[PDB]
Amino acid sequence: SFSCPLCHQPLSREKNSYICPQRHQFDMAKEGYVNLLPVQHKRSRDPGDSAEMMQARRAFLDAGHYQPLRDAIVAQLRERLDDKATAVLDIGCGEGYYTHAFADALPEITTFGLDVSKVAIKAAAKRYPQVTFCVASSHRLPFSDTSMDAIIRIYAPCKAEELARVVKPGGWVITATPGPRHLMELKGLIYNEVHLHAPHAEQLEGFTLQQSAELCYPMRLRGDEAVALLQMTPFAWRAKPEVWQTLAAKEVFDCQTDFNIHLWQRSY
Amino acid sequence: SFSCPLCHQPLSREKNSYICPQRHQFDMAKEGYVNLLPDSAEMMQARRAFLDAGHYQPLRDAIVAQLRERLDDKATAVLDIGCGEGYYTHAFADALPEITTFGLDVSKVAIKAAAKRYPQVTFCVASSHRLPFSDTSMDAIIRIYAPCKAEELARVVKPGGWVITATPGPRHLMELKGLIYNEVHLHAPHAEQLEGFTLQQSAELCYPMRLRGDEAVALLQMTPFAWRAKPEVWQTLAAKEVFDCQTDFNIHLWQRSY
Numbered sequence: 354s355f356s357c358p359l360c361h362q363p364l365s366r367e368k369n370s371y372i373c374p375q376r377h378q379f380d381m382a383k384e385g386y387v388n389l390l391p392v393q394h395k396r397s398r399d400p401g402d403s404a405e406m407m408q409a410r411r412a413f414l415d416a417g418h419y420q421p422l423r424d425a426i427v428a429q430l431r432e433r434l435d436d437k438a439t440a441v442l443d444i445g446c447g448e449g450y451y452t453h454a455f456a457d458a459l460p461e462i463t464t465f466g467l468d469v470s471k472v473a474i475k476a477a478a479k480r481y482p483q484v485t486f487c488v489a490s491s492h493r494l495p496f497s498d499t500s501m502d503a504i505i506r507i508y509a510p511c512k513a514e515e516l517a518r519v520v521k522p523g524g525w526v527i528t529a530t531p532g533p534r535h536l537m538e539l540k541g542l543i544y545n546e547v548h549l550h551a552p553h554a555e556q557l558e559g560f561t562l563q564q565s566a567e568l569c570y571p572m573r574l575r576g577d578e579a580v581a582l583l584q585m586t587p588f589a590w591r592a593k594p595e596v597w598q599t600l601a602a603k604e605v606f607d608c609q610t611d612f613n614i615h616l617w618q619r620s621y
Numbered sequence: 622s623f624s625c626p627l628c629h630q631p632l633s634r635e636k637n638s639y640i641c642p643q644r645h646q647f648d649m650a651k652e653g654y655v656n657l658l659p660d661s662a663e664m665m666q667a668r669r670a671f672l673d674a675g676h677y678q679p680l681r682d683a684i685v686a687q688l689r690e691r692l693d694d695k696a697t698a699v700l701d702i703g704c705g706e707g708y709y710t711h712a713f714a715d716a717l718p719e720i721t722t723f724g725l726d727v728s729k730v731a732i733k734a735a736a737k738r739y740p741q742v743t744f745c746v747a748s749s750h751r752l753p754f755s756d757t758s759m760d761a762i763i764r765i766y767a768p769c770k771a772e773e774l775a776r777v778v779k780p781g782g783w784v785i786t787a788t789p790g791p792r793h794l795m796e797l798k799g800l801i802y803n804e805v806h807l808h809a810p811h812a813e814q815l816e817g818f819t820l821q822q823s824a825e826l827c828y829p830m831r832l833r834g835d836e837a838v839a840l841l842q843m844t845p846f847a848w849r850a851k852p853e854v855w856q857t858l859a860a861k862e863v864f865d866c867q868t869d870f871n872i873h874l875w876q877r878s879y
């Protein structure tokens with residue numbers, strides 16, 4: 354039920370191509386995703402998130418350190434969605450560590466994983482068949498209005514209007530971002546005085562906060578795992594050698610995680 | 622000296638904004654920079670950390686020379702392309718106290734930082750695609766590692782004006798890329814040419830550096846080949862208390878035909 358990245362009209366499908374009323378065709382890569390981006394802009398980049406690191410976030414998550422969060426969302430959905438659900442969408446579905454679990458937990462429905470990392474989507478789509486992965490910029494969702502029963506937003510940004518447009522009325526939106534104390538001990542190894550900042554409750558014109566939770570728990574990280582984790586965080590470069598030397602030789606590093614989950618309904 | 626990102630016409634500077642005979646709105650932010658626009662912050666920051674540690678001071682030093690040496694009493698304007706957060710621009714601005722030093726970049730976060738830190742430089746945010754200035758207004762345009770069609774170069778530059786570019790030479794950061802390369806081959810970068818301009822001087826500037834693990838990491842974060850670096854390579858380099866690598870800077874002094 355995609356929309357045309359270009360004319361924004363329903364994408365009708367023929368075998369393995371998507372075509373819109375005005376003859377815009379998008380083919381499916383051999384793996385199964387649907388590229389939906391332009392032809393040659395900014396694709397050329399300044400990564401940070403290229404194959405190397407994707408394999409990291411991935412390899413890190415495959416240790417399930419974050420599974421609690423997935424479990425939380427999965428159950429969250431297993432509950433709100435009724436038996437009249439057709440499909441859910443996962444904005445920012447990276448290589449789909451989280452999404453494939455949602456799908457495996459919602460068989461009767463179609464699971465979509467949108468992300469903007471071609472390299473990521475490729476990896477996802479190849480590993481997880483139970484998900485229809487599409488590759489595009491979510492500044493304007495690649496879906497027809499009122500087409501989704503729920504949308505999962507795990508730390509990936511999005512506009513309110515698009516939420517209102519794509520989500521059926523009575524539908525859901527589930528968002529999860531880091532909480533104040535998320536990964537303190539780590540930030541504790543590199544900052545002058547660690548400033549945790551108290552997040553203001555946000556709002557989605559069009560929805561209703563039906564539940565707000567917090568999920569905090571401690572992780573016993575091994576040397577590598579820690580460094581690995583430090584490696585994929587905004588501050589990584591403030592870590593002076595000493596930090597990495599110790600953090601890496603550390604038998605067990607202790608770090609707590611604090612995620613902030615939300616759950617709104619698309620008003621009827 | 623600006624030029625409408627809209628009607629491509631002159632710009633009236635009235636108090637804290639600019640407009641033309643077109644009701645086209647472009648105002649001045651609280652920091653002093655102007656946005657004529659129709660990476661992250663941790664890096665603009667990590668970059669500035671590295672640049673301020675003074676490892677590219679030589680480069681800034683030499684370019685300043687070029688300027689002090691070529692512009693005369695009649696100079697007035699001097700645009701810097703890709704000015705980022707002002708690390709080099711301002712240095713010029715000082716050196717040239719009689720002319721106006723403009724600094725441009727497409728990075729608000731970065732521009733803003735400089736706008737706020739370097740007051741002796743009129744900064745603005747826009748693309749390098751079409752220079753935000755009127756024809757033949759600049760007396761010199763500095764272009765350290767920035768892209769810019771030679772046409773805009775020629776159009777905005779007063780005749781007999783100058784263009785100073787700075788780009789990586791054959792050996793630039795060898796050792797770095799030597800860390801993330803099976804084969805150590807990266808042959809002769811050739812012919813940067815500027816139609817409409819006549820090369821007046823070419824210089825190379827190579828000197829060794831003694832970087833600290835994090836400095837190396839930040840530098841690699843500024844490098845085009847970074848995306849190739851494996852994790853083990855990032856962790857390792859970061860752990861090294863002292864990493865050694867050379868610099869290879871090519872500098873061209875182009876003069877605008879009369």
Ligand SMILES: C[S@+](CC[C@H](N)C(=O)[O-])C[C@H]1O[C@@H](n2cnc3c(N)ncnc32)[C@H](O)[C@@H]1O
Pocket residue numbers: 410411414445446447448449450451452507508529530531536586612
């Ligand atoms: C709210 S937490 C933040 C994690 C990290 N500790 C940090 O400081 O940014 C969820 C993170 O998991 C990652 N994520 C979400 N979906 C993913 C996917 N499908 N594959 C790989 N990573 C994913 C994102 O980088 C996101 O920031």
Ligand SMILES: C[S@+](CC[C@H](N)C(=O)[O-])C[C@H]1O[C@@H](n2cnc3c(N)ncnc32)[C@H](O)[C@@H]1O
Pocket residue numbers: 668677680703704705706707708709710731765766767789793794840843844845
């Ligand atoms: C002189 S450095 C050479 C380092 C280069 N990244 C390398 O591969 O070794 C050139 C880089 O610095 C940027 N630059 C010049 N001035 C800057 C400023 N004031 N703030 C941020 N970046 C700046 C250029 O646009 C370019 O990306």
Ligand SMILES: [Zn+2]
Pocket residue numbers: 357358359360361362373374375376377
């Ligand atoms: Zn179309």
Ligand SMILES: [Zn+2]
Pocket residue numbers: 625626627628629630641642643645
């Ligand atoms: Zn105009």
